[PDB]
Ligand binder design. Sequence first.
Ligand SMILES: CCc1cc(-c2n[nH]c(C(=O)O)c2-c2ccc3c(c2)OCO3)c(O)cc1O
Length: 210
Amino acid sequence: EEVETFAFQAEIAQLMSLIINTFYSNKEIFLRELISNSSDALDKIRYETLTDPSKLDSGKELHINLIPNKQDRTLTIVDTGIGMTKADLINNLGTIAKSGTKAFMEALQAGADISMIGQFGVGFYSAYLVAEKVTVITKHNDDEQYAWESSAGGSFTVRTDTGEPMGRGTKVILHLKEDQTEYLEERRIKEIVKKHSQFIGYPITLFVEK
Ligand SMILES: CCc1cc(-c2n[nH]c(C(=O)O)c2-c2ccc3c(c2)OCO3)c(O)cc1O
C-alpha cells in the first residue's frame, strides 16, 4: 500500500506533546470533544442536504455509534457526518487550520486547564489523553476513503483505506493506553455520555460487547 507521512505543523506537535505528557486528571473530556466534532460534521452534511437531497445518497442515517472492543483495546467513535476529503483531513488534523491553537498554547502558559481545549477548536487532540495511537478513517462524498493515523511524536500518515467501506462519515479509532481501559467499560461509557453529551441532536448508540 502507498503511505504518505507528514509532519504536524509545529504548534500542533507542541500541543500534542503537552497533552501526552500531562497528568491532567479529567481525561474523560475526550469523548465530549469527539462527539462534538461528530455532531458538527453531521450538521454539515444535513445542512447541505436541505438544498441537495442527493447528498445523502451515501447514507441517510445521521448518527453516532460508540464501539468499545476490549480484546483490541480500542474505543471507536463512528459518525455518518460529512466526512473529510484528503486535503481537509490533512489540513484539519495536521495544522492549526481554523483553530485558536496559538491562543490556547498561551492560555496554557497562563495555567488554564485543558478542559477548555474544545473552546479553542482543537478538541480532537484530547484523544491523546487516553490513546497512544489514533486512527481516523473518513469518507466524504467528493473523495475516496482515507485513513489518517498518528502515535504523535511529530508525524502522521495518510493512506487510501482498503478497510470496510463507510458510505460517508468519519470513524475515530482510539488505541487506548494501558491504564485508560475504563473507557471500554459499559458503565463508564454510559456515565460519560450523559455528563458531557446528552445535548447532542443526533442519536448516540453504545454497542455493548457480546
Ligand atoms: C478527527 C476529528 C473529527 C472530525 C470530523 C469531521 N468530519 N468532517 C468534518 C468537517 O468539518 O468537514 C469534521 C470536523 C469536525 C470538527 C472539527 C473539524 C472537522 O476540524 C476542527 O473541528 C468528525 O466527524 C469527527 C471527528 O472526531
